[PDB]
Write a protein that binds this ligand. Structure first.
Ligand SMILES: [Mg+2]
Ligand SMILES: [Mg+2]
Ligand SMILES: [Mg+2]
Ligand SMILES: [Mg+2]
Ligand SMILES: [Mg+2]
Ligand SMILES: [Mg+2]
Ligand SMILES: [Mg+2]
Ligand SMILES: [Mg+2]
Ligand SMILES: [Mg+2]
Ligand SMILES: [Mg+2]
Ligand SMILES: [Mg+2]
Ligand SMILES: [Mg+2]
Ligand SMILES: [Mg+2]
Ligand SMILES: [Mg+2]
Ligand SMILES: [Mg+2]
Ligand SMILES: [Mg+2]
Ligand SMILES: [Mg+2]
Ligand SMILES: [Mg+2]
Ligand SMILES: [Mg+2]
Ligand SMILES: [Mg+2]
Ligand SMILES: [Mg+2]
Ligand SMILES: [Mg+2]
Ligand SMILES: [Mg+2]
Ligand SMILES: [Mg+2]
Ligand SMILES: [Mg+2]
Ligand SMILES: [Mg+2]
Ligand SMILES: [Mg+2]
Ligand SMILES: [Mg+2]
Ligand SMILES: [Mg+2]
Ligand SMILES: [Mg+2]
Ligand SMILES: [Mg+2]
Ligand SMILES: [Mg+2]
Ligand SMILES: [Mg+2]
Ligand SMILES: [Mg+2]
Ligand SMILES: [Mg+2]
Ligand SMILES: [Mg+2]
Ligand SMILES: [Mg+2]
Ligand SMILES: [Mg+2]
Ligand SMILES: [Mg+2]
Ligand SMILES: [Mg+2]
Ligand SMILES: [Mg+2]
Ligand SMILES: [Mg+2]
Ligand SMILES: [Mg+2]
Ligand SMILES: [Mg+2]
Ligand SMILES: [Mg+2]
Ligand SMILES: [Mg+2]
Ligand SMILES: [Mg+2]
Ligand SMILES: [Mg+2]
Ligand SMILES: [Mg+2]
Ligand SMILES: [Mg+2]
Ligand SMILES: [Mg+2]
Ligand SMILES: [Mg+2]
Ligand SMILES: [Mg+2]
Ligand SMILES: [Mg+2]
Ligand SMILES: [Mg+2]
Ligand SMILES: [Mg+2]
Ligand SMILES: [Mg+2]
Ligand SMILES: [Mg+2]
Ligand SMILES: [Mg+2]
Ligand SMILES: [Mg+2]
Ligand SMILES: [Mg+2]
Ligand SMILES: [Mg+2]
Ligand SMILES: [Mg+2]
Ligand SMILES: [Mg+2]
Ligand SMILES: [Mg+2]
Ligand SMILES: [Mg+2]
Ligand SMILES: [Mg+2]
Ligand SMILES: [Mg+2]
Ligand SMILES: [Mg+2]
Ligand SMILES: [Mg+2]
Ligand SMILES: [Mg+2]
Ligand SMILES: [Mg+2]
Ligand SMILES: [Mg+2]
Ligand SMILES: [Mg+2]
Ligand SMILES: [Mg+2]
Ligand SMILES: [Mg+2]
Ligand SMILES: [Mg+2]
Ligand SMILES: [Mg+2]
Ligand SMILES: [Mg+2]
Ligand SMILES: [Mg+2]
Ligand SMILES: [Mg+2]
Ligand SMILES: [Mg+2]
Ligand SMILES: [Mg+2]
Ligand SMILES: [Mg+2]
Ligand SMILES: [Mg+2]
Ligand SMILES: [Mg+2]
Ligand SMILES: [Mg+2]
Ligand SMILES: [Mg+2]
Ligand SMILES: [Mg+2]
Ligand SMILES: [Mg+2]
Ligand SMILES: [Mg+2]
Ligand SMILES: [Mg+2]
Ligand SMILES: [Mg+2]
Ligand SMILES: [Mg+2]
Ligand SMILES: [Mg+2]
Ligand SMILES: [Mg+2]
Ligand SMILES: [Mg+2]
Ligand SMILES: [Mg+2]
Ligand SMILES: [Mg+2]
Ligand SMILES: [Zn+2]
Lengths: 62, 100, 84, 208, 99
RNA sequence: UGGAGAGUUUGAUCCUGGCUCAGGGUGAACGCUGGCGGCGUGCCUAAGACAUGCAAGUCGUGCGGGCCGCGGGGUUUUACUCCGUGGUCAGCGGCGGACGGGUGAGUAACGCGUGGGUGACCUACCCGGAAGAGGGGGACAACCCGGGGAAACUCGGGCUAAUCCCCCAUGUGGACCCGCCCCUUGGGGUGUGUCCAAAGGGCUUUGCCCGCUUCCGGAUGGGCCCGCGUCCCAUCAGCUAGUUGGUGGGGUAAUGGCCCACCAAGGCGACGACGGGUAGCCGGUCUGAGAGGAUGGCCGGCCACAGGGGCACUGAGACACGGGCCCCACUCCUACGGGAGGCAGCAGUUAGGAAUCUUCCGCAAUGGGCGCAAGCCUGACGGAGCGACGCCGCUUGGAGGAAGAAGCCCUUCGGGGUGUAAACUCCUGAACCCGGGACGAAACCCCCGACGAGGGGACUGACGGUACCGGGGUAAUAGCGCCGGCCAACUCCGUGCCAGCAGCCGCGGUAAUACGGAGGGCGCGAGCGUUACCCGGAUUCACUGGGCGUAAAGGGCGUGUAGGCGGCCUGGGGCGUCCCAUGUGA
């Protein structure tokens, strides 16, 4: 399964959640990993397409 | 009303019982071509009169036996071994379909 | 016995029965043999009651049996007022 | 809920004044007057030829942005129209116009449909004597829309009601200015308003 | 911990034996008439068939046998006993039969 | 009254052809975000395993007793019966427990759907029609009695009433054999012979009411049978001993090889038997121009199952979810002395899973069971609760407001943008506070009239002080996706085949509208995206509506079986086909 975005927090024994959708570049891979679910977490300091990338909305004011 | 059907006898080889072969024409549900079909019935002859070829009629009746729920109505056109042959060769040709 | 009773329809908090004949062991919204008029118990319309009063007595003839709250809406339809 | 915020950006973008404010969108300066060019950094730049899709798109929004409603509520009416009789399309405007909050704008009780809505929502408006607080009400012929009693006065009505003395209200319309009440008379034929819109395209659009 | 209409079953137990008991008598008596009607004794035979006939219907009123079963019994019975006594026998009594 | 296409094979073209997007749908789930209300909807996986409560009871107008009462029968020293009187615990008997409720495992079959059949059949309670209730005997609980058991209780011993049980009798009337009669598959009529009926309880008691038994009808609900229709693999081509028919029996409400004997050797299959795989079927539902394709979840109709299996009893009715016996698996209790349980009922727990709720309220209403009726039971149902899961409705404001501040973006440093946006000024006013306050409820019953027709009179609202009504009254959450082409929305910066994007075509190699952030823009909005799946587009299984010289596709060539198709004329038949009428199509 493919791990998307920039960096993660996945050693070996790490619970995960599989999505669906190949990569095309990498042959054999046919599934994505959802971010921010179970032991795989969202993308740190990502401001745009946070719906994917399991990134919660940051505070903007203070 | 009780069903009424018309067919040829192909078996007298049961005691006081016979086998009537019924055709029906009708169009194909999707392709509309007008096509035939067949069903065999085990007809009751409590006085084994009717015989091979007897183009006859039969009628839905109370269960005489398993498989057997038609009594014969009346002869219509005796002696039709020509139609019978069709059923015969067809069943014969089956041997040359033996998956060997 | 067969019966005549109130079969609920409509919506939550918006009752709208259908007066009807069926077996006393059918569901109260189950299949029926014949509908005979409606009844909004909330009087939200002029046409808030109706019977085919002929059929009503017909089934009553053969041996139907309405409810303690179905006769009231048939007594209120002269089913019982029996002339002189 | 509804659209809220920058409106004058929309008299433009669509590239055509659509009188969406109170008097401003009627006064020398309706977001277009001064800057009759699309919003944002890329405003005073030469447009490229739109797609046919783009053309149809802009025409739809325009219309909706005029009446100012959700895409939700909007399309139901199209399909409703699309389902009905004969012209089963152009009739659309009739369904749009039967909206309570729409009518109240035409009846000059308010000036912005936005202002109209806040009245209906606050229930300062009545129909046939009924406190009706629902801006989606499809009104019909002979229905009567009047200010309620607790609000017959109110500074906001009087002047808004007053300034109507001037123009011939819609053929399908009527107004006892003193009596604070109006009558939906009929279904506005396509004729009865040449909107700046080509409804033919909205149809074409929605059949994706 | 449970419904006490388990009686409904305990009720069945009596109704079971009661109607079972009568039912054994029916056949053991029905037994007789047949054997006898085969050994010419058309006298003592139609004494039983007459007793047979009563034994059946008397339970038929109740909840044991019902319907055309009594009929189905009695039929095939006197449809048979008589068709035994054809072996001479001599109708010692129409005392069962509308001969 | 209904039909649109685009992207990608080439340097380019036309064609074939496949992949891909734009549409609509869902019992959904997941990510970011989340204000209100309404009406819906919610174990799609383990038909896996379940703690606890509850889901079926009722009548003292069947009967006998317990205790409590109830007053007071009445007393050779705390009562006493005497009913009635209540109510009472059960037992006796009676009706319902076979409906309602859940589930979809199994089932490719008359299970279903549709049209018919039964001279081959049952149908309790309800209604109508005809006649009777003449009398005679007895058992088991209860109570008592001892034994045994830890209990579960259990055996044994002894009395007793009825609508319990038995018998005699009566016979309108019914059944059975043989006859003739008509009719006709065991329908109807009759002749003789022989068999069959029972029940009492309550009184506005001397009259009625609630029940009893036979028969024929009616109506309702069914059982069985029949024709046609109903998935994938022929890489399953042969199948069959109750197998097929007969005769006679057994059995049932009744047909039948349903079972059993005996006799015959038949029965089935390229029109796809037999075998295998999947599946509960339909009304519907989704999509589609349509023809179709897809699907069966909530609602309704039917079938099937009630831990896995088997079996029968009672009964009008079942082989019975919350009845019974047995076997197995599993779990629990116990002085272990041994016994107990069946959530696919309502909630709820666990496990599995990406995922699906309250161990709530009330019989007020509707419906169902019992009863003369009050009244009783009803996790059916009527409501409430939880979840943006869906649809719908509504709010986070409105008018004003600059040649248009600040900050932030670009900048050819002239300026442009965000932007009437804000601020700010007026106005209204979601929420919240006060008051009032439902509809849903009219009958059962009660009065007069005969408790009938009738008028009339009376009790009861779980939801709930809820909606709604009045007044007062506050400017009061916005998010998500995208902005290379298809496809609507462009610019700085960072990065430098790295980090990364991607539905396809493809972007990244120090000037990236394709990565990452930013400004700006497009698109929806308490929602926005994503994933999975169905239909469309796909005329890409083409009946409507396609092809086979070189694009994938003519059998290497004959002969020929079944099958498909068939020239010119006139008749009869009217099968197909066509019309009308009618029923059915819930
Ligand atoms: Mg992206
Ligand atoms: Mg039923
Ligand atoms: Mg009444
Ligand atoms: Mg039209
Ligand atoms: Mg029985
Ligand atoms: Mg269309
Ligand atoms: Mg090439
Ligand atoms: Mg190229
Ligand atoms: Mg193609
Ligand atoms: Mg193409
Ligand atoms: Mg379309
Ligand atoms: Mg889609
Ligand atoms: Mg709700
Ligand atoms: Mg479960
Ligand atoms: Mg398991
Ligand atoms: Mg328990
Ligand atoms: Mg049941
Ligand atoms: Mg059921
Ligand atoms: Mg359920
Ligand atoms: Mg099969
Ligand atoms: Mg098969
Ligand atoms: Mg007597
Ligand atoms: Mg003892
Ligand atoms: Mg004893
Ligand atoms: Mg006695
Ligand atoms: Mg007698
Ligand atoms: Mg007869
Ligand atoms: Mg009796
Ligand atoms: Mg008494
Ligand atoms: Mg039934
Ligand atoms: Mg045998
Ligand atoms: Mg036989
Ligand atoms: Mg037989
Ligand atoms: Mg039976
Ligand atoms: Mg065939
Ligand atoms: Mg095949
Ligand atoms: Mg199978
Ligand atoms: Mg299944
Ligand atoms: Mg279908
Ligand atoms: Mg449709
Ligand atoms: Mg449609
Ligand atoms: Mg179709
Ligand atoms: Mg189907
Ligand atoms: Mg499903
Ligand atoms: Mg379901
Ligand atoms: Mg259903
Ligand atoms: Mg279970
Ligand atoms: Mg049961
Ligand atoms: Mg069982
Ligand atoms: Mg069953
Ligand atoms: Mg249970
Ligand atoms: Mg449960
Ligand atoms: Mg789990
Ligand atoms: Mg649960
Ligand atoms: Mg629920
Ligand atoms: Mg109730
Ligand atoms: Mg009731
Ligand atoms: Mg009652
Ligand atoms: Mg009482
Ligand atoms: Mg209870
Ligand atoms: Mg309750
Ligand atoms: Mg409920
Ligand atoms: Mg909601
Ligand atoms: Mg969500
Ligand atoms: Mg400016
Ligand atoms: Mg500025
Ligand atoms: Mg403003
Ligand atoms: Mg104010
Ligand atoms: Mg009040
Ligand atoms: Mg009441
Ligand atoms: Mg009255
Ligand atoms: Mg009254
Ligand atoms: Mg209040
Ligand atoms: Mg107020
Ligand atoms: Mg504010
Ligand atoms: Mg303000
Ligand atoms: Mg988008
Ligand atoms: Mg698009
Ligand atoms: Mg573009
Ligand atoms: Mg520069
Ligand atoms: Mg650089
Ligand atoms: Mg750069
Ligand atoms: Mg470069
Ligand atoms: Mg992109
Ligand atoms: Mg970017
Ligand atoms: Mg931005
Ligand atoms: Mg932006
Ligand atoms: Mg074709
Ligand atoms: Mg082709
Ligand atoms: Mg050719
Ligand atoms: Mg080649
Ligand atoms: Mg080729
Ligand atoms: Mg060739
Ligand atoms: Mg050849
Ligand atoms: Mg060859
Ligand atoms: Mg030929
Ligand atoms: Mg020919
Ligand atoms: Mg010809
Ligand atoms: Mg028709
Ligand atoms: Zn403006």
């Amino acid at each position: 399964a493919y791990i998307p975005g920039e960096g993660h927090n996945l050693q070996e024994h790490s619970v995960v959640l599989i999505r669906g959708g190949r990569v095309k570049d990498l042959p054999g891979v046919r599934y994505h990993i959802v971010r921010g679910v179970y032991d795989a977490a969202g993308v740190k300091d990502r401001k745009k397409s946070r719906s994917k990338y399991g990134t919660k909305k940051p505070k903007e004011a203070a | 009303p009780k069903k009424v059907l018309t067919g040829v006898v192909v078996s007298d080889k049961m005691q006081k019982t016979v086998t009537v072969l019924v055709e029906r024409q009708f169009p194909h549900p999707l392709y509309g071509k007008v096509i035939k079909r067949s069903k065999k019935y085990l007809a009751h002859d409590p006085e084994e009169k009717y015989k091979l070829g007897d183009v006859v009629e039969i009628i839905e009746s109370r269960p005489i036996s398993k498989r057997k729920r038609f009594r014969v109505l009346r002869l219509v056109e005796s002696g039709r071994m020509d139609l019978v042959e069709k059923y015969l060769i067809r069943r014969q040709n089956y041997e040359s379909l033996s998956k060997r | 016995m067969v019966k005549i009773r109130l079969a609920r329809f409509g919506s939550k908090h918006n009752p709208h029965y259908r007066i009807v004949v069926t077996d006393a062991r059918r569901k109260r919204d189950g299949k029926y043999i014949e509908k005979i008029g409606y009844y909004d118990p909330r009087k939200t319309t002029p046409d808030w009651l109706k019977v085919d009063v002929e059929r009503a007595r017909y089934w009553l003839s053969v041996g139907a049996q309405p409810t303690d709250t179905a006769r009231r809406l048939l007594r209120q339809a002269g089913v019982f007022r029996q002339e002189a | 809920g509804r659209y809220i915020g920058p409106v004058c950006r929309l008299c433009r973008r669509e590239g055509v004044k659509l009188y969406l404010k109170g008097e401003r969108c009627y006064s020398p300066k309706c977001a277009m007057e001064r800057r009759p060019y699309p919003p944002g950094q890329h405003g005073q730049k030469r447009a490229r030829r739109p797609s046919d899709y783009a053309v149809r798109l802009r025409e739809k929004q325009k219309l909706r942005r005029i009446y100012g409603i959700s895409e939700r509520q909007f399309r139901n009416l199209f399909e409703e129209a699309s389902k009905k009789k004969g012209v089963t399309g152009s009739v659309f405007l009739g369904l749009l116009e039967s909206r309570l909050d729409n009518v109240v704008y035409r009846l000059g009780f308010a000036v912005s449909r936005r202002q109209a809505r806040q009245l209906v929502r606050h229930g300062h408006i009545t129909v046939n004597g009924r406190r009706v607080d629902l801006p989606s009400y499809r009104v019909r012929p002979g229905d009567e829309i009047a200010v309620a009693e607790k609000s017959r006065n109110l500074e906001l009505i009087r002047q808004n009601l007053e300034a109507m003395k001037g123009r011939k209200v819609g053929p399908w319309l009527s107004l006892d200015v003193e009596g604070m009440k109006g009558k939906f008379l009929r279904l506005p034929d396509r004729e009865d308003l040449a909107l700046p819109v080509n409804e033919q395209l909205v149809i074409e659009f929605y059949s994706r | 911990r449970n419904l006490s209409a388990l009686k409904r079953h305990r009720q069945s137990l009596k109704r079971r034996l009661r109607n079972k008991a009568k039912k054994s008598a029916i056949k053991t008596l029905s037994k007789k008439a047949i054997q006898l009607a085969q050994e010419g004794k058309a006298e003592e035979a139609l004494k039983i068939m007459r007793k047979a006939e009563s034994l059946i219907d008397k339970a038929a009123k109740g909840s044991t046998l019902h319907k055309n079963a009594a009929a189905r019994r009695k039929s095939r019975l006197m449809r048979k006993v008589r068709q035994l006594l054809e072996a001479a026998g001599a109708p010692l009594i129409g005392g069962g039969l509308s001969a």
